[PDB]
From a paper:
The assembly of tau into amyloid filaments is associated with more than twenty neurodegenerative diseases, collectively termed tauopathies. Here, we describe twelve phosphomimetic, serine/threonine to aspartate, mutations in tau, which we termed PAD12, that collectively induce the *in vitro* assembly of full-length tau into filaments with the same structure as that of paired helical filaments extracted from the brains of individuals with Alzheimer’s disease. The tau sequence ([Fig fig1]) comprises an amino-terminal projection domain (residues 1-150), a proline-rich region (residues 151-243), four microtubule-binding repeats (R1-R4; residues 244-368) and a carboxy-terminal domain (residues 369-441). The tau folds of AD and CTE comprise residues from R3 and R4 and the carboxy-terminal domain.
Next, we investigated whether AD brain-derived tau filaments could seed the assembly of PAD12 tau, and if this seeding could be sustained over more than one round. We introduced sonicated AD brain-derived tau filaments to a solution of 40 mM (∼1.5 mg/mL) 0N3R-PAD12 tau and performed *in vitro* assembly under orbital shaking at 500 rpm (2 min on; 1 min off) for 48 h in a buffer containing 20 mM HEPES at pH 7.3, 4 mM potassium phosphate at pH 7.2, 300 mM sodium citrate and 4 mM TCEP. Under the same conditions, but without the addition of AD seeds, we observed no filament formation within 48 hrs. Although we only used extracts from 0.8 mg of AD brain tissue for reactions that contained 60 mg of recombinant (unlabelled) PAD12 tau, we observed no lag phase in Thioflavin T (ThT) fluorescence upon addition of the seeds. Instead, ThT fluorescence increased linearly directly after the seeds were added and fluorescence plateaued after 48 h (**[Fig fig4]**). The seeded filaments were shown to be PHFs, but they were not capable of seeding the assembly of wildtype 0N3R tau in a second round of seeded assembly. To test whether this is also the case for PAD12 tau, we used filaments from the first round at an estimated ratio of 1:2,500 to recombinant (unlabelled) PAD12 tau for a second round of seeded assembly. We again observed a linear increase in ThT fluorescence directly after addition of the seeds, and cryo-EM analysis of the seeded aggregates still showed PHFs (**[Fig fig4]**), indicating that PAD12 tau can be used for multiple rounds of seeded aggregation. For example, AD-seeded PAD12 tau filaments can be used as seeds in a second round of *in vitro* seeded assembly, whereas AD-seeded unmodified tau filaments were reported to be seeding-incompetent, even though both tau constructs formed PHFs in the first round of seeding.
Residue numbers in the entry:
A (entry chain F), B (entry chain E), C (entry chain C), D (entry chain A), E (entry chain D), F (entry chain B): 307 to 378
């Protein structure tokens, strides 16, 4: 007999009064990559040769992550 | 007999009165990479040759992570 | 008989009156990497040759991590 | 009685057997300048706030400069 | 009586068998300048706030400078 | 009576068998300058706040400078 019965009533919350006046200003750059062969198998995530700029300004941006597992 | 019955009532919380006047200003740069062969198998996460800039300004940005496991 | 019954009532909290006037100003730079062969298997996380800049300014930024395990 | 009679018979010369395989590769950068007032008079040469790249490969590039003056 | 009669028969010379395989690779950078007032008069040469890169590869690049003056 | 009669028969010379395999690789940097007032008169040469890179590879690069002056 198994009674798998977890209970969650928890909270993740925020208040912010004002959000702004943010400046992101990159000055370029240079990237070089050389290879002869690539061979990727079975759940590969790959990034080769990048020059990436990100500005991320969510009003909340809170995260909650859950995982339930039962195995025989 | 197994009675797996955890209980969660917890809180994660924030208040911020004003959020701003943020300046991110990078001055370029240079990157070089050389290989003969790449060979990736089975749950590989890879990053090769980057010049990446991030500005991240969440109004909350709080995190909660939970994990429940039972095994026979 | 097993009675796995933990209880959580905890708080994680912040108050901030004003957050700002932040300057991030990197002065470039240079990176070089050389390899013959790369060979990655089974749950590899890898980063090769980078010049990466991050500005991270959460209004809260609190973390809570939990893990429950039972095994036979 | 002034006899002003300079004589020039001189030479400036070069040989180069082969000229090439030159790589110029700049990685960005950042420049900022602030002023309230500017006031320039009478033979001013000025340069304010620059990010300049030059490649100069003349097959000779030899120079000769002469100046003759007589004054009463 | 004045007899100003200089004589020049001089030589400036070069030989170069092969010129090349030159790499110029700058990694960015950052410059900031602040002023209230600038006031320039009468034969001023000025440079304010720069990030300048030069590659110069003349096949000869020889220089000769001459100056003759007579005054009463 | 004045007889200003110098004679020049001089040589400036070079031989080079091969010139090359030169790498110039600067790693960025940072410069800041602050002033209230600048006030320049009569034959001023000025440089304020710079991050400048030079690669100079003349095949000859020889220099000769002469100056002849007579005054009453």
């Amino acid at each position: 007999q198994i009674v798998y019965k977890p209970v969650d009533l928890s909270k993740v919350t925020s208040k912010c009064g004002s959000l702004g006046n943010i400046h992101h200003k990159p000055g370029g750059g240079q990237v070089e990559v050389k290879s002869e062969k690539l061979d990727f198998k079975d759940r590969v995530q790959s990034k080769i040769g990048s020059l990436d700029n990100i500005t991320h300004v969510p009003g909340g941006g809170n995260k909650k992550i859950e995982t339930h597992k039962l195995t025989f």
